[PDB]
Amino acid sequence: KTFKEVANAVKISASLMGLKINVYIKADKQKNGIKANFHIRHNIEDGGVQLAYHYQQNTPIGDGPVLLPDNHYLSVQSKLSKDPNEKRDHMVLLEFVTAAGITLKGEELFTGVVPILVELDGDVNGHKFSVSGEGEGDATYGKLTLKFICTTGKLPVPWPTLVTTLVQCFSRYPDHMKQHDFFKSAMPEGYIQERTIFFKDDGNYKTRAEVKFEGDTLVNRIELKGIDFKEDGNILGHKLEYNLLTEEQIAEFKEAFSLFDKDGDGTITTKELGTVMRSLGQNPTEAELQDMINEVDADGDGTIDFPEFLTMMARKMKYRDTEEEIREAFGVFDKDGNGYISAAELRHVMTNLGETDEEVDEMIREADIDGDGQVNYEEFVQMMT
C-alpha cells in the first residue's frame, strides 16, 4: 500500500464523513413549496476552487394541490461541451439527475421526451447579457440535453456559473420516492424558482425563474442580478475552467473501495465505514454512519455498493478539494500539528489501518523532496498528484 493510496483513503474517509455534494430539498409548508441548499465547486484556472453556495425557494404558480416532500436530495451528473461548428459564445450541456436520500397528474407530462426552452436576462455589476437555450428533457432517465447561446455576444461571466440557473422537473424520482416530486406535481401551471448564489470572496447572484408548460414545451424564463462582484475576480475576470476518466483513475477508486470493503463482498456497510473512521481516530455514531451512507446510497438499501462508490468518486471529480480539506487530511497524519509528518506519525496511521521501519522510511523518502526526513504540507500535496 503506497503513501498516495493511504492518503487517498484518508481523504475519502473525510469526504464520506463531511462532504455534502447533493442538492438538499426540504418542504416549505408556509409557501406550499420547497427550499433547497447545495454548493457548487468551480475549478479556478492554474489551480484552486471557487465555491458557490446556493439557497433556493420554489413555490407553485397555480392553486392546484402539490406534493410537499420529506427531506431528500438530487444527485446531478453534468457534462459541459462545445459545438465545434458554433461561432457564437455557447454552452452544450448534458445532465443526468436522480433523486435519492429516502431509504427503502403533473408526472404524466414527463413520461416521454419534452422540448425545453430557456431564456435568461442577466445583469452582473451592470454587465448585461441574454442567454437562450433549447433542447429536451427525458425525465424517465433524469436526462437533459440543452444548447445555450449568449444572444448579446460575449457572456460577461463564465458559463459554468450559470448552469444551476439555466428545470428540476426533469429529475428521475425512483418508484419509492414518487410522492416527494414537488416539481412535476406543480405542472403544468408551474413554479417560481428563486435563488441566491454566494460566490465565496466575490459577489452573489439573485435569480427568479418561471418554469411552466407553454403548450408542449417546458419553458424556464429567468432574471438574474449579480452585485458586488470583483471586476478582476474569478467570475468577471473569467478565471474558471469550462469543463473536466482514465483506467488508472478507476483503478485508484477501486483500491480505495477495497480498503473500506474489508470482507470483499462489493458493498460498504455502516460497520465497515465505522471501522475505518475509528481507525483514523473518529468516533461517529450509528446514526451519523447511516447519514454518511445515505449521501451515496442511490438505491436506498442502506449500503454503498461498488457502482454507487464509483459514481460518488466520478461526481467528486467536479468537487476539487479546498485547502481546508487537504489540511484536514494532512492533519490525520500530522497528529502533533507541527506541520511535518514524521516516520513515527506515518507508522502510527499505517499501523492503525492494519498495513517495517525500512518500509515506512522508504515511503517518507519518496515524498520527501527537501530531504529533511519528514513530509510537509507542500510535499503531501505533490505526493498525491
Interface size with Ca ion, residues (CB under 5 A): 17
Contact residue for Ca ion among 86, 228, 265, 323 (CB under 5 A): 265
Q: Minimum CB separation from Ca ion for residue 101, in Å?
A: 12
95 belongs to the binding site for Ca ion (CB under 5 A): no
Q: Which is nearer to Ca ion, 151 or 267 (CB)?
A: 267
Look at the block and give the residue holding cell 484536514.
328
Stretch in the footprint of Ca ion (CB under 5 A) among 40-48, 149-157, 214-222, 257-265: 257-265
Q: Please report the DSSP string for 142-210 in residue order.
A: TEEEEEEEETTSS-SS-GGGGTTT--GGGSB--GGGGGG-HHHHTTTT-EEEEEEEEETTS-EEEEEEE
Contact residue for Ca ion among 95, 181, 202, 297 (CB under 5 A): 297
299 belongs to the binding site for Ca ion (CB under 5 A): yes
Q: Which is nearer to Ca ion, 119 or 261 (CB)?
A: 261
263 belongs to the binding site for Ca ion (CB under 5 A): yes
Q: Which is nearer to Ca ion, 267 or 322 (CB)?
A: 267
Q: Which is nearer to Ca ion, 53 or 340 (CB)?
A: 340
Q: Minimum CB separation from Ca ion for residue 339, in Å?
A: 7
Interface positions, 350-369, toward Ca ion (CB under 5 A):
368
Stretch in the footprint of Ca ion (CB under 5 A) among 40-48, 94-102, 173-181, 334-342: 334-342
Burial 223-250 (b: 16+ CB within 10 A, else e): ebebeebeeebbbbeebbeeeeeeeeee
Look at the block and give the residue holding cell 413555490.
59
228 belongs to the binding site for Ca ion (CB under 5 A): no
Stretch in the footprint of Ca ion (CB under 5 A) among 60-68, 236-244, 273-281, 298-306: 298-306
336 belongs to the binding site for Ca ion (CB under 5 A): yes
Residue 201, by phi and psi: left (phi above 0), alpha (psi -120 to 50) or beta? left
Alpha-helical regions (H) of the chain: 3-18, 182-185, 247-260, 270-279, 286-294, 306-316, 323-333, 343-352, 357-367, 377-384
266 in Cβ contact with 338 (< 8 Å): no
Q: Which residues contact 288 (CB under 8 A, 6 or more apart)?
A: 17
148 HSE (CA, 13 A, CB side): 26
Contact residue for Ca ion among 214, 301, 359, 366 (CB under 5 A): 301
Q: Which residues bind Ca ion (CB under 5 A)?
A: 261, 263, 265, 267, 297, 299, 301, 303, 305, 334, 336, 338, 340, 368, 370, 372, 374
